[PDB]
Amino acid sequence: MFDAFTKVVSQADTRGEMLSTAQIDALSQMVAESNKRLDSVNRITSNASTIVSNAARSLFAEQPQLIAPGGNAYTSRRMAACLRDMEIILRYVTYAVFAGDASVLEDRCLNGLRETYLALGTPGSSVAVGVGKMKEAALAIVNDPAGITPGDCSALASEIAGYFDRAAAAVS
Amino acid sequence: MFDAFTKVVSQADTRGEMLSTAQIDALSQMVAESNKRLDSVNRITSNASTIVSNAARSLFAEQPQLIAPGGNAYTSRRMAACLRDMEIILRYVTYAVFAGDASVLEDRCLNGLRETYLALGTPGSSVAVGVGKMKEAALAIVNDPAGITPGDCSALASEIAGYFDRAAAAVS
Amino acid sequence: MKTPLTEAVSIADSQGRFLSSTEIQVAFGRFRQAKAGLEAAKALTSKADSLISGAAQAVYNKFPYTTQMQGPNYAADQRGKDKCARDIGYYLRMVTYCLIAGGTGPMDEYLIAGIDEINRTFELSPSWYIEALKYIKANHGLSGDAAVEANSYLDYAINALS
Amino acid sequence: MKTPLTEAVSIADSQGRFLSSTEIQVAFGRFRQAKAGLEAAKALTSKADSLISGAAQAVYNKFPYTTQMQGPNYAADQRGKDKCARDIGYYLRMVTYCLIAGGTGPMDEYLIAGIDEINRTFELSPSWYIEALKYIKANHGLSGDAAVEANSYLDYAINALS
Amino acid sequence: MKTPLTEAVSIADSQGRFLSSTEIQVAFGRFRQAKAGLEAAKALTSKADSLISGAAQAVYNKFPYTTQMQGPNYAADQRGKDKCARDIGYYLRMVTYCLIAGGTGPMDEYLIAGIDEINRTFELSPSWYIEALKYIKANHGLSGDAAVEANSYLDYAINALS
Amino acid sequence: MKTPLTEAVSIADSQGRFLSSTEIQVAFGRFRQAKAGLEAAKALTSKADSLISGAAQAVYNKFPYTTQMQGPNYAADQRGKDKCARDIGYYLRMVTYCLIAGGTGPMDEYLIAGIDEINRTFELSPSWYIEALKYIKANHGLSGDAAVEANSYLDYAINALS
Numbered sequence A, B: 001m002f003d004a005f006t007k008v009v010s011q012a013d014t015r016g017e018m019l020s021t022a023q024i025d026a027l028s029q030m031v032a033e034s035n036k037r038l039d040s041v042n043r044i045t046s047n048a049s050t051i052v053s054n055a056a057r058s059l060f061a062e063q064p065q066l067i068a069p070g071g072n073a074y075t076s077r078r079m080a081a082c083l084r085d086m087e088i089i090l091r092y093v094t095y096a097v098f099a100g101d102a103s104v105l106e107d108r109c110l111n112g113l114r115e116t117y118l119a120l121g122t123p124g125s126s127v128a129v130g131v132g133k134m135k136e137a138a139l140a141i142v143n144d145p146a147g148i149t150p151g152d153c154s155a156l157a158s159e160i161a162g163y164f165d166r167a168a169a170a171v172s
Numbered sequence C, D, E, F: 001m002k003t004p005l006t007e008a009v010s011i012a013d014s015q016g017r018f019l020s021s022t023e024i025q026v027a028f029g030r031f032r033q034a035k036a037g038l039e040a041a042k043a044l045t046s047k048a049d050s051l052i053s054g055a056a057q058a059v060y061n062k063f064p065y066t067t068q069m070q071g072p073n074y075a076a077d078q079r080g081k082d083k084c085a086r087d088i089g090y091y092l093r094m095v096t097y098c099l100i101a102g103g104t105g106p107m108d109e110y111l112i113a114g115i116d117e118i119n120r121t122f123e124l125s126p127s128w129y130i131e132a133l134k135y136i137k138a139n140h141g142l143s144g145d146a147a148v149e150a151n152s153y154l155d156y157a158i159n160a161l162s
Ligand SMILES: *[C@H](C)[C@H]1/C(=C/c2[nH]c(/C=C3N=C(/C=C4\NC(=O)C(CC)=C4C)C(C)=C\3CCC(=O)O)c(CCC(=O)O)c2C)NC(=O)[C@@H]1C
Pocket: A066, A072, A073, A077, A078, A079, A081, A082, A083, A085, A086, A088, A089, A108, A109, A113, A116, A120, A122, A123, A124, A125, A126, A127, A130
């Protein structure tokens, strides 16, 4: 549970001194691009149900063993729980790119859910591939400027793909 | 639990039609003066501990029976609970003038605390006089401007004195 | 009723503390939002009747079977069209209410909270309402940041539907 | 750590929903705040050492007994003055941290949460720190809305003290 | 898994007592049920493939738009028909499983518990499955008390759908 | 090669006469143009690589299908991106060449004269190049009269495309 600003504050307090000037110029540029961060975040957020349905749509086209009887996502209840797990992961990705820090995504999902999927018998590979495909579709949905002014989303495609790869690797 | 805007929305939904134009001009003037309300609220909020200490200071100078042994606010624990009750009332006044509606002040204090003070044996008269003196001191602290751009706090003085009189009458 | 000032008061109340600078930041942000959002809500109020009829006609166009088959859920008869366009106007009115309130609270309390079981009991496909909301968000004709947040509310209704 | 973006994420997480327009209103408000608050924090960083010495001298001026009586809680000896001005600089650094963070979170987590029991155990009067914070909020020399919210944070520290 | 013997054991366990004559009454009743229900399940197993194809054809007949419009939820292409008739056979297999188990437990655990959110996410109308189950309960061709309780399970699936 | 001095010589040659004051007026005008145009061409030479990558990324952003579908005309694979950004740099280099030459001659001889049949034979949409040239003319960052005539050359390329 950290912001960007609280991250700089905690680092400056562990140093024990005041915040240096270059960190303040970095935070000024962050405050200039934080809305920029946000535009992707809102256009990412508005299409979330389409994102998770298309992600499960491609995943269960790709691995039909999960839909097959005896598969892990075969049962209707389990399949609803599967879509719930995916939607939760996407929501915490949107939270982490809202606050601009991966510590919220770590705190809320990562440390426990790997052991949860081991204990449940859930294959970590399929949900890792699903989070990867969902992240690819999310950047693909974010990067297209439909009715939006001309700007630069470079570094924020960098950050969003970082968050999605952190989620997919912590899942394993 | 209502705003000004949610109050107009609930009234327009009970009417069943859209919001009329004159209500929208009223809400536009509210949006113009809502900061005016916000500025007044902030100078009310910053001096809150001084307000409750001066209010109890004048009240226990005024009614020394409460400090007298056997009095309702005599015991150290009870006197701390007395100051806690006053600070709670001031805080919910600040919340109601933040949201611009008395429904939060009603919801959080009013319907129960009269019966609470009856059942406790708390004299409702002294706490009513204390809320009145606290409200008088609060408007007196708000209305003076020190290093602040000139503005009309007068529209608010009406509303803040309304909230304080509603609290003092619901206490009884 | 998830509106920003209400939820700020709920945060400060559940924490048990007074208001801080956080709620005042929330407030100058909310006033910044409302300063365009109220005029955008008035503009939607102006264009509302033609938007409702256009959404109903687009819904009849994409799903032509609903005009044809006999059934009280379908708008084949005239009372289906009256009730149908009534709930089109319901959706548009909730969009304007969330534009005034500044949050998704009014649609969440008046539309979303029971819409799934209602469409389950009444054999109403939610895709009809998705098509209508898509036509509205295409044809509302606003511009700029008001248009983006209007599309945000309509997309929120779409994601709550399906 | 009560900062606006963190508490917006906490609201959206405890509700179990996605982000809405409410959090974006919170965000444009927070950026509006930080757009002056970061430069004001840099200005306080510049004037910090003289403000610390002036606050310590004002505290010795209003409470002259602390310089006189022998006692390890009092700053009669030199180590009391080193530790004393160290916690003056602690208070000022927490003020700058809350100016950067945009909320009362850093002072609430680094100062406020245990200050009452510490002053109870160590025989430190909190009125000394109230006098020092009053001198700082008088002598910080900022202007405008940055000055008002700086005074807001310092007054919050004062109300948390006594 | 709401089957009669399982729920009798759950009653006796939650009460903390031994088995009584109540559970033995439940048992002679359950054996009375199974004495026809197992043969009826075998007869449904025999007629299953033609019932599945007839239900799919009746569903295409009542809802002809699903064969026409392009859409991955609709069975316009061939993979939609493979997956579609697969979930027809799923519904029929769950009916036979509840016929063997003697309670609505297998359909409640394999079908019902998530079907609403699945049809919400995938744009599947449940009325398609209602039409298919109605065709199955019309055309299963059983007779007598086995036919009545088969219709009971299918009507239970219908009421759980809409 | 429609450059002003060349076409002045062509006019005087086709008329069969010597040079007059008209060509000298053309010349002091051309020198007036080149006196800023050469430095503007050097500035475009400096910013060229980042402009090429930004134009390619904007083209992938507005037309996301070209990155996805398999096809040798589309830039799904890596060789499509190498060749693609190569013709982005081709367009930018022709813009700089016309900035130096002082007329639309170099782009007319190196790009325009066959571009229609090439895009016809190769299944290349010219709208991709229109989007890239629009991004370049938005992001070149020049100012003043050099910026206006740079936009003139880019708009000429756009009108020659579609
Ligand atoms: C689909 C992508 C993959 C998949 C998903 C799946 N998950 C479950 C069950 C659980 N998943 C969780 C995960 C979380 N709970 C949390 O609170 C959070 C963070 C906030 C996470 C990430 C938990 C706790 C469970 C068990 C309890 C429960 O109701 O859901 C299932 C069902 C297993 C079952 O037997 O019910 C499924 C199917 N599994 C797959 O097959 C895909 C690879």
